[model samples]
Target: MNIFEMLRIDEGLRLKIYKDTEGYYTIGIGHLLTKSPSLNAAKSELDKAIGRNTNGVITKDEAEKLFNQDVDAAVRGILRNAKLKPVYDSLDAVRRAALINMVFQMGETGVAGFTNSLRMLQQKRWDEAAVNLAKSRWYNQTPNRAKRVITTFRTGTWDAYKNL
Candidate 1:
């Protein structure tokens, strides 16, 4: 599956604002607008999500729009990272989507911190890469999603995309 399709399942769409498991204010497809250095242009829209006085609801089109922007940021950040670009480029569509999913869950900077794991992926060492990823706090934070992602990295297939 494509990156967007995969993320549509992985992140899941939301029309109302809610706190993520970690308690950050999130909306749409996991858009953590409360975080600074992001969604600055959409402060008004974000305020609506917060619903201090107004309803915290958004249209499907608006949610998709925000999701597209967030996806772009993740893709661009992955490409722009000096360390991640080469490794990202070397992978096929399935593997590439895996990286994008990771960047989507964690920030680009967070994914960038995977120095050794990226190295293993760059070298096409799937087992090592999967193992390295499993050792991360990200894995601990969301084991289910992380398991699917790590399996994708290890098998280099869309098998992990089965079901939801």
Candidate 2:
């Protein structure tokens, strides 16, 4: 699957502000605005996303626009990474999608922290890469999603673990 489709399943869309699993203020396809820092800042961002003032609400079209912007940023974030760029280039389509998905969730900086795992992936050591990711705190925080991502890395195919 493509990055957008994969993300759609992983991060279900929400047109209005909602508290995430960790109780952060988030909206529109997992775009984190801020912590429970309140609506003032978030509402401002929401306005920018939808291109109009509102009472902390957005349309589906606006959410899709925001989602695309976030995904584009994630792609560029990976591409601009000196370490990840070469590794990203060497990967197949599915593996690339898997990597981008990680970046989309945690930002490129967060994914860049997986130095050894990226090395393993670049070297095509799938099992080692998967094991490395499985050992991460990211996995501990969201094992269900992490399992699927790790499986995608291991198998070089779209994940089938199912639950989002």
Candidate 3:
């Protein structure tokens, strides 16, 4: 089952997954962290809370939860499994983190769709990557997010608005 199924939430609520002390997995609304041992359990509880709060319409309280979760590590894991070690190895820490965040938000299939952009990034073509990033649907939908990540790629500092 996908993480959503495991969490058992309705269609509208956002899922926020994170690790806690004692190796427990936590999921919650807003910035609150759960103390539950099972990630599924935390997600379930948070889903209930969302349902209650939204009166059964929508619950977007978990927006930007990926930033709170282990997104970078998860993306790295995905890349490692896909035999993209060379790409991983070539990126500096900031670019790696930014790319990982992008992949996390966009998913592996979405990342794969950016073949030209990926090629540019792999070749350390910063300007080309930035241009390609701005040309994406993601950029159209989330211009601020795209700009922030592209800026991170250009400069080696963690900038504000790194959500995704």
Candidate 4:
């Protein structure tokens, strides 16, 4: 029996969300969650969302689709933050993505609290944004991830961690 199909075949393992080599939340095959700040955090959230409670394995091919839901929820959160609104609409992709990235990392409320950094980003001032980011308590808390965001804000790069 030949059950050959094009689209289903295109739904390759890569586009699917699966635990990484280190058992992290990821989509596009080892690509970390765009909105999850840490592996343990994603692990717990996924545990509850999927009802895994213990063992976590993606059951549906559409399992990765949950990101869209998460993104929408994140946007709602960002909207509540008046400080982030300007950059949200000003730079739809770059500035907006950076805002979303920060929100995802620190929570909508946590990110907006960075007044100076957010202000620099709103103005599209990468150099100032980088400097401001490096000066935050968050920098001391998570320098590696903060550097990723700082590098992106400074050089206009995508958060490369998501690719791994």
Candidate 5:
């Protein structure tokens, strides 16, 4: 079973998954849907699950153990068709995946709130878009991850934010 599948069955676990790494309320299934006495444990667990899921390498048993059908499907839906679609469409598949990953973590509403950012992307303002991306609430909320994602988007490179 995958993490999404696990989240499906134990919907309540969703609350537990929230990212508290820097002692702040950030976003992302992997970041948000985790808990630990320290940030390292939280990151480790989430990283493992995400690594498996993104590669389409998750086991059925793993999915079953982590989530249920409903939550699993819902999570998958969120991942595939979240707010990042508009931004994703503007880029290559690899870059698109990076944006999708960010949206999956932060949520559509959160990403959409970056009005200027959206405008920059919409106008094909790559540099401005990258700048706007950095100015989001998400950046303040999850500085480390946001920085990485912003760098990736700006460079038109996919490798930077591939993991988080």
Candidate 6:
């Protein structure tokens, strides 16, 4: 199952703090806090999952795997949208990946604000789309990463795109 679904099923998406069976002052999806985030013997299995360590610490490998899953899903959703699929298909792999990252970070709903930019992409107006990707809060909020993505959109190749 997806990590989010797994979390909801396992923890029940509690919006408020409540006592677990162990009566720990826990909140928000089985997150334990205060008086006891115990281990196996201590009930310390917070990150207890396929991607988690015994102590509940998510490792780099886990993070990347989960990230890929989320990115794939987000991109699929983007491509599945009737309004977006045309724009998504017109872009190259690099641009597709860039859009996927944008959707992953901002959500497809947030990216929906790019109506004009999306039209630019649909018309194969690479420069306009690139400029749009570089414009607005997205770029200012993340210049370096946005630079790489904008580069990929403009150049459609890795040479111009900087490494993360």
Best by lDDT: 2
Q: Per-residue CA lDDT of candidate 4, range 55-128, in tens?
A: 44455444544444545666788887677777677664544555665675457888878888877877888898
lDDT of 6 by residue, 32-113 (tens): 4445544342223334433333343444454444445655677788977876778788877666766665665566887878
Off by over 4 Å in 2: 161-164
Rank list by lDDT:
2, 1, 6, 4, 3, 5
For each predicted model, how many residue pairs clash, with residues at least 3 apart or on different chains?
Answer: 0, 0, 0, 0, 23, 7
Q: Which stretch of 10 consecutive residues in model 4 shows the poorest summed lDDT?
A: 1-10
Best candidate according to TM-score: 2
Q: Write down the RMSD of all candidates, one decimal each.
A: 3.8, 1.6, 11.5, 9.2, 10.2, 11.0
Question: Which runs in model 1 stand beyond 4 Å of their true positions?
Answer: 36-54
Q: On residues 1-164, what C-alpha lDDT tens digit does candidate 3 reach at each position?
A: 22222112211223545553234444332223356665556666556644444222233434434333544445656566453445656888777766665665555667667778777778989887888878888888767657767776766566443222
Candidate 4: list runs displaced more than 4 Å.
Answer: 1-48, 51-57, 60-63, 159-164
Candidate 5 or 1, higher lDDT: 1
Worst 10 residues of 1 by lDDT: 35-44
Runs in model 3 deviating more than 4 A are 1-73, 81-84, 159-164
lDDT for model 5 comes to 0.50
The positional error of residue 139 in candidate 6, measured at the CA in angstroms, is 1.0
The CA lDDT of each predicted structure is 0.83, 0.86, 0.55, 0.59, 0.50, 0.59
lDDT of 2 by residue, 68-122 (tens): 9999999999999998898899999989989998998887888988999999999
Instruction: Indicate the TM-score of model 3.
Output: 0.54
lDDT of 2: 0.86
lDDT of 5 by residue, 55-124 (tens): 2233445444443433344345545654544555666554454455455555556555676776676566
User: If both were scored by lDDT, which would come out higher, candidate 1 or candidate 2?
Assistant: 2
